[PDB]
Design a protein around this ligand. Structure first.
Ligand SMILES: Cc1cc2nc3c(=O)[nH]c(=O)nc-3n(C[C@H](O)[C@H](O)[C@H](O)COP(=O)(O)O)c2cc1C
Length: 383
């Protein structure tokens, strides 16, 4: 064989255009054609996924050029594996995007469309699941169109691929959450290294961290309710998770950002972890993010009229939910009163996000996110 594959994820420049994508595609088609390289490029919501395959040397040279490119950043290698045969034969470099992005760019082949519509807000689908699903989908589309070019492929076909991948990971993840919840319930600080290793194994990205945390959080809320653990135990666990998070994920603020956002807790609530996660998730898709733990409504009012950052995410406290709801209500309402900013947007999580959007209108908050991992998606909608 002697064929190799390389795949990475990167953050497209915030000012990226169709002309750029097309230039990349033409350059890449030409060069890959000469150098005997194949693969696919997937663009969705400011993010690139790419797969490249060929002889080792070719892949290495082209990666040398790509890494230094200035139309994207945070290139993270995801795989460098030997393959038995090409997954994208005939595709020197084929472009593809999500259905939503197809709408946003005004496109309608030859660009392979991926319908994420049905699975995008499914919290059981982890990051690597989406990546592998995209890979398999595109490889298959490549085969198909190699056989029957004028035979169109349904975008929403991808959904099944994604769901299938997630389902493959489900059991193992359940084990992980169980083991984890046990650790957090016993001595999370005495066994922090184990917590970290688990998290590191099962949560490659920050959103994954968020999924695991939601699961553990309901487990522990149940445990605390049934008086099986103490409040002190929950505080310990919370600390342990903050430490583990910071050790593992700690993205710098993106220099070229899609926008700026303020993440704040409600005064008295200490959503330290949830705010950190929110910041990590938003940073990972290209948002400039600031975390604030204000102690008065007025403080935040000042910071907002100073920043002129028209977007505010109120991070929920998923472990102090005795009175998160009415507190958040009062807080957002108060904030809206002391504020004179027609462009201001507010997003809310927790139990408040579980209410029907009618209540959301009534709330003065603009939109909700019933699960942490849904936050990026919820933000893009308002933008
Ligand atoms: C997301 C992305 C994917 C790219 N993929 C390829 C590729 O598969 N093959 C290629 O030759 N260039 C690719 N490029 C372009 C290279 O980064 C770079 O423009 C080119 O290889 C060097 O230009 P040259 O034609 O003067 O050698 C890609 C660029 C970006 C931003």
């Amino acid at each position: 064989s002697d064929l190799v594959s390389c795949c990475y994820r990167s953050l497209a420049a915030p000012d990226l255009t169709l002309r750029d994508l097309l230039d990349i595609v033409e350059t890449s088609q030409a060069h890959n054609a000469r150098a005997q390289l194949t693969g696919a490029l997937f663009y969705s919501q400011g993010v690139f996924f790419q797969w490249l395959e060929g002889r080792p040397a070719a892949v290495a040279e082209v990666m040398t050029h790509i890494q230094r490119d200035r139309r994207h950043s945070n290139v993270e290698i995801l795989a460098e594996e030997p393959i038995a045969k090409r997954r994208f034969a005939g595709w020197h470099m084929q472009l593809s995007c999500s259905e939503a992005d197809m709408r946003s760019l005004g496109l309608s082949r030859q660009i392979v469309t991926v319908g994420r519509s049905l699975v995008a807000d499914n919290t059981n689908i982890f990051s690597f699941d989406r990546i592998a699903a995209v890979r398999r989908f595109l490889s298959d589309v490549c085969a198909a169109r190699t056989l029957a070019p004028d035979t169109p492929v349904e975008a929403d076909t991808f959904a099944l691929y994604a769901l299938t991948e997630a389902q493959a990971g489900r059991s193992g993840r359940a084990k992980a959450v169980a083991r984890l919840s046990d650790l957090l319930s016993t001595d999370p600080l005495g066994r922090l290294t184990e917590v970290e290793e688990l998290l590191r194994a099962h949560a490659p990205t920050a959103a994954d961290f968020a999924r695991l945390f939601e699961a553990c959080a309901e487990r522990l809320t149940r445990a605390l309710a049934e008086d099986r653990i103490s409040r002190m135990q929950v505080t310990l666990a919370y600390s342990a998770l903050q430490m583990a998070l910071r050790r593992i994920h700690h993205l710098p603020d993106p220099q070229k950002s899609v926008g700026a956002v303020l993440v704040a807790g409600v005064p008295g609530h200490k959503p330290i972890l949830e705010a950190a996660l929110a910041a990590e998730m938003l940073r990972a898709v290209g948002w400039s993010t600031s975390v604030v733990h204000p102690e008065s409504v007025a403080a935040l009012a000042a910071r907002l009229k100073t920043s002129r950052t028209s977007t505010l995410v109120v991070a929920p406290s998923l472990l102090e939910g005795t009175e998160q709801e009415a507190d958040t209500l009062r807080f957002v309402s108060a904030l809206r009163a002391r504020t004179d900013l027609p462009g201001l947007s507010i997003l809310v999580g927790g139990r408040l996000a579980q209410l029907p959007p009618s209540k959301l209108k009534d709330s003065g908050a603009d939109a909700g996110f019933a699960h942490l991992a849904l936050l990026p998606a919820a933000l893009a909608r308002v933008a």
